[PDB]
Homo-oligomer: 298 residues x 4
């Protein structure tokens, strides 16, 4: 089926056991692949502590009894390309204390000398500084902050990992429905960016397909209560409810279901698949009407 | 702006003053065009009676005081291409009494000798014999009946009017959102067909653009209480409510708003516009979530 | 273990040979260990069964590990029909249709329930449009409706009758071509329409089947493949020019072997895809993504 | 009378010459009788104002009836900025930026309210990506974000500041290129991304503006046009090859004169379109519809 044994993979955007990031890394390992991580500096120490402590061990369990193992947990700030781009505030920011080589370019180099060429690239990271504000209120600063962090980070990740990705390697990034249709509350220009992330998924499928022979795809995924989601009865608690009531599949959306899907797009089975936006959302993309609306009877 | 004076137009699917059919014909006339009609035989006598009586005269008023005038009200059954295709039941059906030349091919000929070559083609007609049944219940007979009447009718209309349409002429057909996203209640395979109607709108934009130089477009339009709609607190009464509560524009959807749009796609202003699906629906296509759902607070 | 289909049973409708995507799926459903059954269009069941019995297709029946794919049952199946009573005497007595019965959908679906019991997986790999070499402006109504009766509705009726016997969490997947959403000249006779209806009935059914049965429904929009059915379209094959176009214009510059879609389907029909429904998956080497042919005669070589 | 815009006032942001779609719209908004105002990128207001005052563009300013289009006001306007405080001393004192002030969005939007009062119509016809000759894999972050700051966000800020002064039923429309939804090679520097953000912010804003103000928002995805801005992309113009491609591959085999989109916009911004919002309209001679370039080197001539 899917033995990715002898393949190296890099997962960017993993700092806990709740994000989609984790899930992906978890299914990749379960298929035999070597799995590394890029983690946001400030929250790195804690993540490692979590791991070392042996408290994320229930989460690291392989359906056979093995515990996942990571080839490296790399400090990574996708807001930064090369060292010359990191401000002096940040360099001096306490929470970035005693870590270096965390810019995209830098990590890419570290991975090559540490692990060699790789096969798989996962992009699981976004940041909207004005996510809670409607577009009519989102300022330029936030909009661009929301785009730089959540969209260009991908193009830059490809730009630097691509040159060290084997042929037939694959790369995946996670988008949200708000990119295509209006989803109130997904403000701060996160929708705008997500849309750019999808376009770039296509545009890159072309540039990476031709230059490197590397497939590039996106998953538009459904509501999941990651820590990044929890931080906006919350906006995503209501999100989960809607999708549960209105989608074709009346079932819960687990971190994994995206991991599963991700595995695929990252496995040989998907050798013909590129520039695709794959809906892992219990089929809610397909509905053109709320069935539980207050406008129909109950 | 839009003086279609000296242009001949044919509108298929008009039997009352409530359908989108009417609206289109009404805006076309108001721009100076000659306007003919194709009307379902059984309901022809009555339509004419309505007109002659001087009771649809409030509906026929031009924003200047003139009353619309039609160059011809032609019997038309779009379920039938050429006379050899009409069963012996129908030929003998009382409601088709004392009318002939109502097959598509036949009407096309009648229009040419009666009016000459034409410029504009409007397609405003659909029929689902199992519209009220979910797809899992729709039988082959109904599905195909639903497709023949509502989709192929267009391709056949182009096939026969195309050869008598001037260069730069245009043709328009009306679709529903259910074609792209799942709209419960729009069963009987009407959704399937609508989707075929859109594809064919594209496919024909290509064949009619190249062979005849004729533009071909569709309007995916919002809920309107035509008589054809009323016949399914009804399924469309609830339809109108939903769209009113959930769309970007909180406003009523009048027959006209589609007529307006139609005028455009049929005017010179749209000389570069072909194969398009244009949403005249108060912007509800753009939402990816019910705002009045019972899942959010009120 | 990431994809394990042991204990699950699959029905792959539309398999007559070993060149079509259909084959590739049965082969991919089965290395995953699923028990696989087939529906073969009646007029060529003899020619197909014989290629099997004889060994001509042994080369195509080899899995990775080096064992041979076997089938739980080869079912006569005409997708144009639903019920014995739908069959016209024209055929009831067609020399090629002789030697077989119970080959309508409702009938197959019965025999499968008798023979194998509830299924978990269902594959719709078939289509038929008599006027496909004809442009839409030259396509007959009869021929158009036939295309749709064969390539689109068949999927519906196939869900209706195989639905009740499908396990919760079951999957079904149909096959489509890009012509549905954008004009591809030469792919005529209403097939482009028919596939569009299909993709939409895949969104609709995903909803209905997804609620009543808890079954998922999906479409794999595939690129061009030299199969018996393709080579029949229209010297230099119309299918060949397509394959050529793709090879020169798709992001991934590579051959499209059927196995590709084979593996693509396997995903969609597996536990891995248990949150994926109503989608159209482009297994086309990324060609869906392009806005321009790159080898245009308008552009520099 | 089917399209009458007498009494309505329009602001067309992004007009420096008489070749761009921008021009064509002001010209189409105005034959409809609307009073029209312009925003010109500061560095070329002199060259533009002078072409007007002189008469060089009289040939382009003639309407059907044979009268001349006049403007209610020509406003200095840099879309990269929102507020006086957003302006860096770099520019505050750029030789080309001298002789003008109050050229940020919030400022223009003020002066327009002072000078003309509430508007009904708003046109976003501008874009700027310094690295557009660069593929995405060679595009800088700074240059990418600039593209987006200039071509996409500008639209947002333009709605924010012109919103409150817009009448209920007002309209706004931006401009896009097919590159947003499918790869068009050569259209780089992040512009493809930027336009995608734009089309999406056109769906989003249509909702927000559509509720708060009752204003409609729409996008016209246009085909290639030889404008100053295009000819600047990259011998044989990159824009020329595009125009050529289209002429050979689009359903309607004809020239795309700017007036086309000119009239297309006029519709969207008029009472006729009062139920149309959040849409992307392809004014491209139907090229959006095609799945294959028909003059491929893979296909027979
Ligand atoms: N939670 C959901 O249901 C949901 C829904 C739709 C889409 N998504 C998408 O999935 C992806 C991951 O979502 P998640 O919230 O499950 O994962 P998550 O909660 O772990 O958050 C994403 C990770 O990216 C990290 N990150 C933020 N800024 C970074 C920077 N500049 N450099 C490096 N890392 C940075 C965050 O710390 C976080 O660990 C995101 O891109 C998001 O857009 C999530
Ligand atoms: N009413 C709405 O809100 C609504 C919504 C979405 C789409 N539409 C579409 O708009 C079009 C017109 O809709 P409407 O209901 O407003 O108009 P309508 O109520 O007048 O019905 C369409 C016309 O077509 C005629 N017709 C049916 N079968 C025919 C046949 N085989 N040959 C010739 N004529 C035939 C009907 O008699 C009717 O007059 C339809 O195609 C429909 O799909 C309507
Ligand atoms: N071949 C391609 O490049 C291509 C591309 C996109 C989609 N598809 C789709 O894939 C499916 C099959 O793939 P293929 O190209 O290998 O076809 P194919 O080579 O298998 O030829 C048709 C297949 O379906 C069966 N079939 C044909 N008509 C039938 C009928 N009316 N009743 C029952 N069975 C019938 C035949 O047994 C045959 O195996 C079709 O639905 C087609 O639309 C094919
Ligand atoms: N030209 C085409 O074929 C084409 C195709 C699709 C979409 N468009 C869109 O149409 C719009 C303009 O059409 P065009 O091609 O005639 O452009 P153009 O020829 O008018 O050149 C850019 C125009 O916008 C203004 N402008 C440029 N940068 C600006 C800045 N940063 N601040 C304020 N104003 C600025 C200039 O005055 C100029 O008139 C753009 O948004 C572009 O994306 C153009
Ligand atoms: C219904 C919402 C589903 C949803 C949940 C989480 C998402 O991811 C993020 C969202 C915002 C920020 C920030 N800042 C960071 C991340 Cl990782 C998302 O894109 C969409
Ligand atoms: C919410 C529904 C909006 C809606 C209303 C009316 C429509 O038109 C028809 C529908 C069914 C039949 C039949 N038989 C005939 C027509 Cl003219 C439509 O397609 C969609
Ligand atoms: C141009 C290649 C795309 C393409 C190639 C082959 C396809 O399969 C069929 C095509 C036509 C008919 C018929 N009749 C039957 C089948 Cl199984 C297809 O659907 C689309
Ligand atoms: C290939 C033709 C498509 C095309 C042509 C011209 C366009 O307009 C611009 C293009 C680039 C820049 C910049 N920087 C500015 C503008 Cl106004 C466009 O958006 C898209």
């Amino acid at each position: 089926p899917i033995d990715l044994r002898g393949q190296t993979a890099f997962v960017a955007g993993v700092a806990d056991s709740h994000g989609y990031g984790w899930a992906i890394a978890k299914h990749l390992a379960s298929a035999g692949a070597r799995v590394a991580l890029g983690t946001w500096p400030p929250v790195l120490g804690l993540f490692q502590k979590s791991l070392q402590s042996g408290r994320l061990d229930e989460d690291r369990k392989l359906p056979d009894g093995s515990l996942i193992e990571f080839a490296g947990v790399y400090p990574l700030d996708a807001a930064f390309d090369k060292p010359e781009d990191v401000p002096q505030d940040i360099k001096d920011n306490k929470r970035y204390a005693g870590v270096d080589g965390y810019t995209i370019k830098e990590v890419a180099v570290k991975v090559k000398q540490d692990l060699g060429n790789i096969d798989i690239l996962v992009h699981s990271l976004a940041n909207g500084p004005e996510v809670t504000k409607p577009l009519l209120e989102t300022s330029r600063k936030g909009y661009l902050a929301a785009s730089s962090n959540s969209a260009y980070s991908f193009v830059s990740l490809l730009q630097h990992f691509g040159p060290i990705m084997n042929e037939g390697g694959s790369a995946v990034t996670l988008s949200y429905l708000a990119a295509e249709r209006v989803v109130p509350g997904y403000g701060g220009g996160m929708s705008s960016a997500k849309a750019a992330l999808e376009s770039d998924t296509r545009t890159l499928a072309w540039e990476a397909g031709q230059k490197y022979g590397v497939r590039v795809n996106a998953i538009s995924a459904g509501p999941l209560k990651s820590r990044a989601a929890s931080a906006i009865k919350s906006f995503i608690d209501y999100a989960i409810d809607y999708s549960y009531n209105n989608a074709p599949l009346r079932r819960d959306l687990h971190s994994d279901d995206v991991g599963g899907a991700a595995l695929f797009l990252l496995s040989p089975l998907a050798r013909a698949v590129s520039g695709v936006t794959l809906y892992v959302d219990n089929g809610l993309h397909a509905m053109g009407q709320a069935v539980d609306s207050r406008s129909m009877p109950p």
